[PDB]
């Protein structure tokens, strides 16, 4: 014979609990990647982005190593 249902209350805050939030952790990860890719794409034109980030990527990085010949540069 059972006298009482068997349960506990999990910690919660603002209607969130750890079981639920843990399911969404991967999703935040992917959104972070999306935001990262997007942000980087938006500043791909910025010379510093090319110099410090994009030109350092192996193989692909030579896409962003471009020199104007001294003969063609007024400045």
């Amino acid at each position: 014979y059972v006298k009482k249902p068997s349960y506990k209350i999990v910690p919660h805050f603002l209607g969130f609990n750890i079981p639920t939030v843990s399911k969404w952790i991967p999703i935040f990860g992917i959104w972070g990647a999306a935001a990262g890719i997007g942000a980087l794409f938006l500043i791909e034109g910025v010379p510093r982005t090319r110099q410090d980030i994009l030109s350092k990527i192996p193989i692909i990085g030579e896409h962003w190593i471009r020199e104007i010949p001294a003969s063609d540069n007024p400045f």
Partner: protein
Amino acid sequence: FSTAEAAGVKVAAQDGQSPISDLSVVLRGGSRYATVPGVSHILEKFAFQNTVPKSALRFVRELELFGGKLYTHTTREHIVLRTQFLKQDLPYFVDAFANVLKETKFQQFELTERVAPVAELDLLKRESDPAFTALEAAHEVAFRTGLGNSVYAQGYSPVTLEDVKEFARQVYAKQNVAVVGNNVVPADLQQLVGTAFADLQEGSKVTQAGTTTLHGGEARVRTSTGNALTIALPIAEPKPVYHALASFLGGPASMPWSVGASPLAQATVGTHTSVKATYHNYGDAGLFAITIKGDSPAEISQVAHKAVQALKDTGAEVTEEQAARAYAKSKFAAAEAFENPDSSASVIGMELLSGVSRIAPENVQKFTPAELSEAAAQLSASAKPVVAAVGQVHALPFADEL
């Protein structure tokens, strides 16, 4: 059902071989005892509201974890509160009933927001059927008070928190409580009820204000939502022969897409009407009713004439075949009533609370054609016929026409 006693409370249990137990608390608190009109219905709807140890919310959430169900209803004689659960969860349900009887908070907001609105939806759903209305109106005419009180709370007469609290003070007492356990080990229930219901007041037996008096008459409930007619005959001396007579006269078909071979069933041929004879024993008085519903007032009127003729014809002569058919249909009706949990609880509830021994379906008396015809004769020759018309009342029959 082994009847016993546990700490002043009458406990009946029958062990079985099923994973499902039904535990019912039967209260002597039906509408014949209602201090104020509708208070028994309101008290029924107040069961499993907030108690001091456990809120309504907490109860419902825990009930869902056991997968249990809750059923409540009010009759003229009882309030029945039934829980259905897995056998092993018995202690929880006993304790929950104890909390309800000992420690219900009865808060004004519960009455206004929770209890009264649910009671109102309950009644509106029942009244969607005009036959319900007709049979209720017939009891009102026949008995006036007591058995004539409405079962259900209505808007025109509001029940107050003080009304319900007072009624509960009387009803929720060792003297007015019976516990009925279907598929419950009887020794285990007695032990649990004995510990849980020990501190419940003793109280006193609730009684009907006034003796049951019988009256004839007419009720003409004008609705726009269907048509029905009850022809009732108040009985001063309730006898078991009226069950046999109700089943004999019959009315519903025993077979799909058919009329039926019963006299009342055969009264509906050529019409989209249905008919049902019922007998209501209330111990000290009874009611024999024939209710006819349909969409056509003209057809109802037509059937109503044939219905009273059928009763007169029965008073003349029943055949042996017909008497045997009545025994068979009545034994069956008794059996299925003792099986259905709602009706079962109230049957044993009556035996425990009053003292009316249950008639086992296998002990249902066989009435000779003489005894049946004599019963129908008394009814055809009644000095106090009741007729309740519902719907287009201008087009339905009157008592003096029947």
